[PDB]
Ligand binder design. Structure first.
Ligand SMILES: CCCCCCCC/C=C\CCCCCCCC(=O)O[C@@H](COC(=O)CCCCCCCCCCCCCCC)COP(=O)([O-])OCC[N+](C)(C)C
Ligand SMILES: CCCCCCCC/C=C\CCCCCCCC(=O)O[C@@H](COC(=O)CCCCCCCCCCCCCCC)COP(=O)([O-])OCC[N+](C)(C)C
Ligand SMILES: CCCCCCCC/C=C\CCCCCCCC(=O)O[C@@H](COC(=O)CCCCCCCCCCCCCCC)COP(=O)([O-])OCC[N+](C)(C)C
Ligand SMILES: CCCCCCCCCCCCCCCCCCOC[C@@H](O)COP(=O)(O)OCC[N+](C)(C)C
Ligand SMILES: CCCCCCCCCCCCCCCCCCOC[C@@H](O)COP(=O)(O)OCC[N+](C)(C)C
Ligand SMILES: CCCCCCCCCCCCCCCCCCOC[C@@H](O)COP(=O)(O)OCC[N+](C)(C)C
Ligand SMILES: CCCCCCCCCCCCCCCCCCOC[C@@H](O)COP(=O)(O)OCC[N+](C)(C)C
Ligand SMILES: CCCCCCCCCCCCCCCCCCOC[C@@H](O)COP(=O)(O)OCC[N+](C)(C)C
Ligand SMILES: CCCCCCCCCCCCCCCCCCOC[C@@H](O)COP(=O)(O)OCC[N+](C)(C)C
Ligand SMILES: CCCCCCCCCCCCCCCCCCOC[C@@H](O)COP(=O)(O)OCC[N+](C)(C)C
Ligand SMILES: CCCCCCCCCCCCCCCCCCOC[C@@H](O)COP(=O)(O)OCC[N+](C)(C)C
Ligand SMILES: CCCCCCCCCCCCCCCCCCOC[C@@H](O)COP(=O)(O)OCC[N+](C)(C)C
Ligand SMILES: CC(C)CCC[C@@H](C)[C@H]1CC[C@H]2[C@@H]3CC=C4C[C@@H](O)CC[C@]4(C)[C@H]3CC[C@]12C
Ligand SMILES: CC(C)CCC[C@@H](C)[C@H]1CC[C@H]2[C@@H]3CC=C4C[C@@H](O)CC[C@]4(C)[C@H]3CC[C@]12C
Ligand SMILES: CCCCCCCCCCCCCC
Ligand SMILES: CCCCCCCCCCCCCC
Ligand SMILES: CCCCCCCCCCCC
Ligand SMILES: CCCCCCCCCCCC
Ligand SMILES: CCCCCCCCCC
Ligand SMILES: CCCCCCCCCC
Ligand SMILES: CCCCCCCCCC
Ligand SMILES: CCCCCCCCCC
Ligand SMILES: CCCCCCCCCC
Ligand SMILES: O=C([O-])C(=O)[O-]
Ligand SMILES: O=C([O-])C(=O)[O-]
Lengths: 701, 702
């Protein structure tokens, strides 16, 4: 092997002048606007099909290979969705038939406007908790069965606003907001929310009466209310909830272990609820043990409702937090299946489909939902091929809402709470990410730990905003104090490494190579300046000021006649200089930062050589400063200004500055900042460190 | 002038093997915590000298060179500080003697604990506005005319004590570097919007109207309405006097800045205008003749110490934090200009400590928060300020005014004080020109400017700043969100690789792709990176693996059926035109298609880019080597390493070699901590440069 290269030394300007650069016209916003309004016939066809995805996938349905599958996954998931809807309507503190409404309308709208083929659309625990908190706040902030009616009305208006926000984000094509939530953040938020839900199910396991607490620290208020009244716990409910929680857990593991052997996952939720409903009815637990039951539900749908502006005004922030969490979750679950089954997934259409589904749901008295991973995993694991299975789940929910709902009358709320608690093992086990992130990346461990605390203390909605803000702040933490280094040549070749990391390294005399391994901007520009000064060994502005002082003294001593100018040196007729400094005042002291123009003097002054009449100036050995900008991705206004100041000061003390390792786009953007001028020129940019070093060597020889 | 190189090709590992690495110790947190508790004699002496800077700059005082200049500068800045304190006590909506207390106490404390030698310590308009808004909130949220102003004075003192406590705590924990979280354009937009706030807040004194104590959000509009809803009750004497003063001061301030050389000292115009205003207001009895609002009679002397209301503390925590952050940012900014202009070191943590102690003492003695005004620090410095003895002399004049000659400021109108404030406001108002400039240079900083302005005008000055800082952190993500990822090519049959779309006569080695992302890769852009890499190579590595696994499954089923035979020559098909019967894997078995293809059981290797027998079809790829130019990739977070590991494993399972080049030794060290390397992904994929990887590939292929 041999890396053999023989090319001329290239400055960025020289390379461009020797290589024809394809002239490429950048696409200005103006043009982008035109193609946007093309109105091509084909274009329109694409748009409409994109907004009504059912017109594409339905006509291509493989009946022989998907119908039976879709049917089975649909009946199974719908059976899960009925119970999940009842439980999550308990989480919202409204009658439970509204949970059935919530499990029927978004699935039906997403069947038409949705792009996922596997996600089960409906409520999930975190969003039901967020919606409940919003309604409790709205009822508190209102200028004046009734309580149930008021809560139900508020749950609908929050949902419509949440959906409108979702619909708006999808129309404006902002479907990329999901990138602003990292893996460590979502993890901490979701385990904190699982702890929230665990705490929220305690009033149903024990059957206690807990107020509608609101954030901050809502979880602790609930815990106090529960354990303060812990002695009133209904044992039958608890034993039941504990029995239901225990059994389902074991069966679920079996389903995850013997999955390959299992033809179909064992439906433990349906079986347990049926047995629970049966034994409660046969033994009349409601009277025998005073257990809390779901009760009788109205056999039908409710008439449409009008969104209340007052609720909208009092819950706008909560609805935003709700829309963002719903989109983050649904997209997240859908993405897993899209990468698993190789089909494209459009976020904008998702927001539109999730927005419209929520509007129809809030209009028809339901509450916000997107998807529950548990129910979706149940849909995908049971043979879900397309959104037809979802249509069958919504059909099962319909059947429950109109004809057989009366069977869910003797079912206890502790059983629903026990199921909702059983679905928490996946999110609760995410506490193991703390140690992993500690080992790998402590900024992401900080993101996780902080999100957990914020979510627990400030709540689901506010905890998330503070968490995203802190997540953005860690980016600054990572780049705030870059490990800048001085480089040196190792091997007498074109390899320049850290000077402190190897032996037998070589630094060309008078030359300094400095590397900042990060983008330079407002938060680290001062640090870059400090580290560059520590690396070169002096402050260029201080050297310039002392040189200007020395030149002022030379001019004062020579025009008085004590120092005669000669083209050979600084001969002095009298060597009786007395100690005296000018002591410039506040108004005049800035004359010491100006460039040294000694053209007035016949002979050049070697500032690094001894001066006449014992004038002392700090002598510098640096003549060439190379800045390795290879990992400097961007600059901002603050940093370009700091950079220019630094360079100007080094140039004014006659230190040639070279910037190497930058691409052509970097020099392109710097031109827009008006960085270059008479003093700082584009000839300071070279291709690599070695190019600059060879240029320096030939200049100096 | 030739770049001539003749060295061996180097993977990062071969370079570490050939060149012995200098062993360096671990900078452990425990041993660092060991140096923390030094208890050394000199260390104790330098710690105490730092916490008490006066013990180091006072003995080193140059009398014959500094004393008279400091005396003159102190006289001037104290005469300015009296009037500025009165005006800012107007801004806080308390009696005007508390502005004198705010101009006295922090200066005397900063004389002892301050590191700056040129800033004038005291209140400035933005902080007086913030303190007044915090005071209104405290009074509004307080659980149930002089008693109204007494409540406001107590709430101001308490807000000040809490602001000083927060500053002193931030200086004790050594967090004096938070000023870096405010960019030049954030500060520019904030100070322009705040100058607009201060302009609107002085209108109730120019016109002499009764405006309620509006609180944010949109207090500037609530206030604009209150003023113009009653613009018919405007006092004409107040407006005329305020106008004339503003005109004169503006002209002289210009005369001052321009003719700096001919004037030995700047013309004191604030002072002269105040004396003339008070004289023509007392002689002509403007108070009775035109019914103008005057400063009134002030209580001669200081007030006894007060105890901070914990209730006010509870109701103003957020406000006090904001008052503390804005105060530190302004003071540090003002002080920095002069540290740099005069070459002396400026400790930021001692700045926080001194400002916090000054605010605590001021609030205890019935003052309001203040850190420094750029206008008054300018007067002290331009009049010859050399040390903080000028601040001591300014505080002595404020003391003289408080105790002895405060009654002279009795007939002075408040419109004159408002006019002085506006004359000082023009400098910050002139920052609207930065909009167009930033638009041309950096639209992200233009966005920071405009959004900071809008957040500060619409929302409060405290919520506005918090919202503004958050959006400025978000623009950092905006920059590194959609990087201009590109494909490189060789240019000049040498070691120069540039954008494939930029020059003519470039050269792509057959089968090699070189991909460059010019940004750090993290959670917000790992998806965009994966998408652009897939667009660059021309295919999806995963789709290929699944199709090959699908094909291999069909090949294997056929073999189990005797329909074809496998021999060292290849696949022998006695039966051709096989029935097409796709397997249709289910949802729980489909994952088998992402597994590495293990065909070792088969006697011969399968050329997946050749023709497969019996109508089997797989996409063919020309790529056999992928170079990733990670030179400008600064950092990698956990999300990015996961996405990265994922992408690389897929390329490797489809037998495409992957190379990461251009990275430094710290970058690779960190990746080892992420558990990135393993049996499939090895540290051999790392090469020093692109040419090294390319040469290594040419050598492999040939
Ligand atoms: C491209 C990015 C898109 C951003 C879109 C942002 C949209 C922002 C636009 C509008 C929203 C903010 C103002 C409220 C709505 C305007 C109408 C209004 O008058 O406000 C009313 C309700 O307003 C409130 O009480 C809630 C205050 C805002 C909380 C939400 C902000 C954080 C969530 C957002 C997260 C942002 C990040 C989004 C990412 C998830 C109050 O005003 P009023 O009723 O006239 O008052 C009269 C007296 N009254 C009060 C008694 C009635
Ligand atoms: C309101 C209610 C909230 C309650 C929350 C309670 C949650 C916590 C409760 C239980 C968590 C229990 C699981 C811990 C990890 C188990 C798995 C693991 O191996 O991790 C390992 C590392 O150590 C860790 O990862 C855990 C570190 C502590 C995390 C919990 C507290 C911090 C929560 C955030 C702060 C909140 C408070 C912040 C303010 C102080 C420990 O396993 P091992 O066997 O020892 O190691 C074997 C070797 N191995 C590591 C290589 C494998
Ligand atoms: C509550 C009270 C708030 C009131 C606020 C009012 C503030 C604004 C009032 C007055 C501003 C007047 C100064 C403008 C600039 C002058 C200097 C300049 O040369 O700039 C130039 C560029 O153009 C600009 O820089 C200005 C663009 C508009 C900015 C003002 C509105 C945006 C404020 C934020 C949005 C707020 C609302 C957002 C929602 C809609 C114009 O100069 P020129 O001579 O034309 O150009 C010559 C060539 N040259 C450019 C190379 C030199
Ligand atoms: C991207 C921009 C935002 C999103 C798009 C714009 C917003 C779209 C969604 C708008 C809101 C949703 C549609 C409208 C909802 C309200 C729709 C309101 O209509 C309700 C009635 O139909 C109810 O009928 P009733 O008979 O029950 O009437 C009750 C009163 N009486 C008659 C009984 C006394
Ligand atoms: C998975 C989705 C469906 C889940 C259903 C619940 C789980 C199945 C097991 C339910 C509990 C066991 C069976 C039911 C026991 C209690 C059974 C309670 O009986 C209700 C009584 O009124 C008698 O039944 P009727 O048919 O007279 O009632 C008519 C009611 N309407 C039609 C007039 C309104
Ligand atoms: C497979 C579906 C779920 C699992 C099967 C269903 C659950 C089976 C377990 C039933 C619960 C266990 C039996 C009941 C336990 C509590 C046993 C409760 O007994 C209370 C009675 O002594 C008096 O009734 P009161 O309602 O007046 O309550 C007064 C309570 N003291 C003061 C007398 C104690
Ligand atoms: C490419 C440039 C433009 C990109 C689009 C614009 C920027 C999009 C990204 C924005 C950040 C990421 C999305 C948001 C994530 C966090 C989304 C956080 O949601 C906020 C809610 O949690 C707030 O709930 P609160 O209860 O605190 O509301 C209180 C409201 N009052 C009471 C104060 C009025
Ligand atoms: C970094 C950690 C935080 C910062 C350090 C810790 C906090 C330091 C600052 C603590 C607060 C400031 C010092 C204490 C202030 C309150 C100091 C309270 O004392 C006030 C009395 O001296 C007033 O005397 P009077 O005679 O007027 O008494 C009034 C009541 N009678 C007697 C007339 C009826
Ligand atoms: C900036 C620092 C000094 C600025 C001073 C302001 C400039 C002077 C111009 C003021 C206008 C005209 C002159 C003053 C008119 C109001 C002057 C009002 O005088 C009060 C009258 O009783 C006569 O004055 P006395 O000498 O009796 O006052 C003694 C008051 N104590 C000591 C008993 C309490
Ligand atoms: C450098 C020194 C400062 C600058 C120079 C000093 C400023 C000189 C300005 C002198 C006063 C300027 C204008 C005043 C014009 C209003 C002229 C109004 O005069 C009002 C009086 O006749 C009656 O007293 P009132 O206070 O009740 O006012 C009633 C007002 N109306 C109903 C009769 C109209
Ligand atoms: C290098 C690693 C260690 C880093 C050290 C710690 C990092 C510190 C940096 C923090 C972020 C940037 C600094 C912040 C500057 C902006 C400073 C922002 O000020 C916040 C206040 O304005 C909040 O005012 P509010 O109106 O919200 O208060 C009202 C309270 N209630 C009524 C709502 C309850
Ligand atoms: C306006 C006062 C009466 C209305 C009060 C109620 C409304 C308050 C807000 C009104 C608008 C704000 C006040 C007016 C602000 C506009 C003031 C806008 O000024 C911008 C120009 O000065 C900038 O152009 P220059 O050529 O000066 O360039 C900058 C200077 N160098 C750097 C080139 C030398
Ligand atoms: C804040 C985090 C980081 C650590 C401290 C958590 C604190 C705030 C938690 C732990 C225990 C909690 C308290 C537990 C009991 C009560 C009584 C009841 O009226 C509800 C609120 C209240 C008063 C809680 C307030 C919040 C609380 C004090
Ligand atoms: C929000 C930013 C981005 C643009 C819109 C600014 C809006 C909110 C501004 C412009 C004009 C302002 C209004 C002007 C007049 C009044 C009447 C008075 O009762 C004070 C508030 C109120 C009602 C203001 C509310 C805020 C306001 C409406
Ligand atoms: C009444 C409770 C208000 C709670 C406010 C919490 C504010 C948290 C700010 C966190 C700043 C760090 C970056 C997000
Ligand atoms: C009572 C009205 C409160 C309004 C609060 C609005 C908060 C807006 C925050 C925007 C933050 C943007 C970060 C990128
Ligand atoms: C926050 C966890 C503890 C909540 C309170 C538990 C019960 C404490 C005693 C209550 C007596 C009324
Ligand atoms: C939005 C700023 C101006 C608000 C209105 C000012 C007063 C206009 C006349 C009001 C008459 C009642
Ligand atoms: C699922 C089994 C339901 C059994 C119900 C028995 C009712 C008996 C009533 C006397
Ligand atoms: C009302 C609170 C709004 C919080 C928005 C947080 C956005 C963070 C962006 C980094
Ligand atoms: C009460 C609002 C406080 C929010 C502080 C935000 C700090 C900005 C950095 C994310
Ligand atoms: C060895 C030097 C010790 C210096 C101690 C200073 C103590 C100051 C207390 C105010
Ligand atoms: C600064 C000039 C003050 C003149 C005061 C005149 C007072 C006259 C009272 C009759
Ligand atoms: O919220 C949840 O736990 C879910 O999505 O299943
Ligand atoms: O607030 C101001 O304008 C100042 O500091 O001068």
């Amino acid at each position: 092997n041999q890396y053999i290269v023989a090319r001329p030394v290239y400055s960025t300007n020289a390379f461009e002048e020797n290589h024809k650069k394809t002239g490429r016209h950048h696409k200005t916003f103006l043009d982008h606007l035109k193609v946007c309004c093309s109105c091509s016939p084909q274009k329109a066809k694409r748009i409409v099909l994109s907004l009504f995805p059912i017109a594409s996938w339905l006509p291509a349905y493989r009946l022989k290979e998907w119908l039976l599958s879709d049917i089975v996954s649909g009946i199974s998931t719908g059976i899960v969705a009925v119970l999940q809807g009842l439980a999550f309507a308990l989480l919202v503190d409204i009658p439970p038939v509204y949970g059935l409404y919530a499990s029927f309308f978004p699935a039906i709208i997403y069947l038409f406007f949705g792009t996922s083929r596997h996600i089960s659309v409906g409520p999930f625990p975190i969003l039901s908790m967020m919606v409940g908190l919003a309604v409790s706040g709205a009822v508190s902030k209102a200028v004046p069965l009734d309580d149930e009616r008021v809560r139900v009305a508020a749950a609908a208006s929050v949902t419509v606003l949440s959906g409108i926000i979702q619909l708006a984000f999808g129309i404006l094509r902002i479907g990329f907001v999901v990138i602003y939530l990292s893996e460590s953040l979502i993890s901490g938020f979701t385990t904190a929310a699982a702890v929230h839900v665990l705490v929220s199910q305690l009033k149903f396991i024990f059957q206690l009466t807990v107020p509608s607490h609101t954030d901050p620290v809502s979880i602790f208020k609930v815990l106090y209310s529960v354990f303060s009244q812990i002695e009133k716990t209904n044992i039958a409910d608890l034993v039941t909830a504990l029995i239901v929680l225990l059994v389902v857990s074991i069966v679920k593991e079996i389903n995850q272990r013997f999955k390959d052997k299992l033809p179909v996952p064992i439906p433990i939720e349906f079986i347990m609820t049926v047995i629970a409903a049966g034994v409660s009815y046969g033994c009349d637990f409601k009277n025998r043990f005073k257990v809390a039951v779901v009760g009788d539900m109205n056999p039908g749908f409710q008439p449409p409702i009008t969104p209340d502006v007052e609720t909208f005004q009092n819950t706008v922030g909560d609805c935003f937090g709700i829309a963002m969490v719903a989109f983050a979750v649904a997209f997240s679950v859908a993405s897993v299946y899209s990468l698993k089954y190789d089909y494209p997934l459009d976020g904008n259409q998702e927001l539109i489909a999730l927005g419209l589904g929520n509007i129809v749901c809030g209009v028809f008295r339901g509450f916000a939902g997107s998807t529950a991973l548990s129910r979706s995993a149940v849909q995908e694991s049971t043979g879900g091929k397309t959104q037809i299975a979802g249509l069958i789940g919504a059909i099962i929910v319909l059947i429950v809402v109109l004809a057989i709902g009366f069977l869910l009358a003797p079912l206890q709320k502790s059983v629903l709470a026990a199921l909702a608690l059983g679905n928490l093992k996946g999110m609760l086990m995410q506490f193991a990410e703390i140690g992993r992130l500690w080992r790998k990346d402590k900024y992401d461990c900080l993101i996780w730990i902080m999100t957990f605390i914020f979510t627990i203390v400030l709540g689901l909605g506010l905890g998330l905003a503070a968490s995203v803000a802190f997540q953005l702040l860690t980016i600054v933490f990572r780049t705030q104090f870059p490990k800048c280094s001085t480089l040196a040549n190792i091997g007498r070749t074109n390899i320049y490494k850290n000077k402190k990391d190897y032996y037998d390294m070589y630094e060309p005399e008078g030359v300094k190579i400095f590397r900042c391994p990060s983008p330079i901007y407002f938060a680290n520009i001062g640090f870059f300046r400090r580290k560059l000064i520590d690396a070169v060994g002096f402050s260029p502005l201080r050297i310039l000021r002392k040189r200007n002082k020395a030149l002022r003294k030379i001019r004062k001593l020579q025009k008085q006649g004590l120092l005669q100018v000669t083209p050979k040196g600084f001969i002095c007729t009298v060597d009786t200089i007395k100690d005296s400094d000018e002591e410039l005042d506040n108004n005049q002291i800035e004359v010491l930062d100006q460039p040294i123009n000694t053209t007035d003097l016949p002979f050049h002054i070697d500032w690094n050589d001894d001066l006449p009449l014992n004038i002392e100036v700090p002598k510098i050995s640096l003549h060439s400063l190379i800045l390795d900008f290879s990992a400097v991705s961007f600059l901002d206004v603050s940093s370009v200004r700091g950079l220019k100041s630094i360079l100007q000061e080094f140039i004014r003390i006659k230190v040639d500055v070279y910037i190497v390792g930058t691409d052509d786009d970097f020099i392109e953007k710097l031109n827009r900042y008006e960085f270059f001028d008479g003093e700082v020129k584009s000839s300071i940019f070279f291709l690599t460190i070695h190019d600059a070093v060879l240029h320096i060597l030939m200049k100096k020889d």
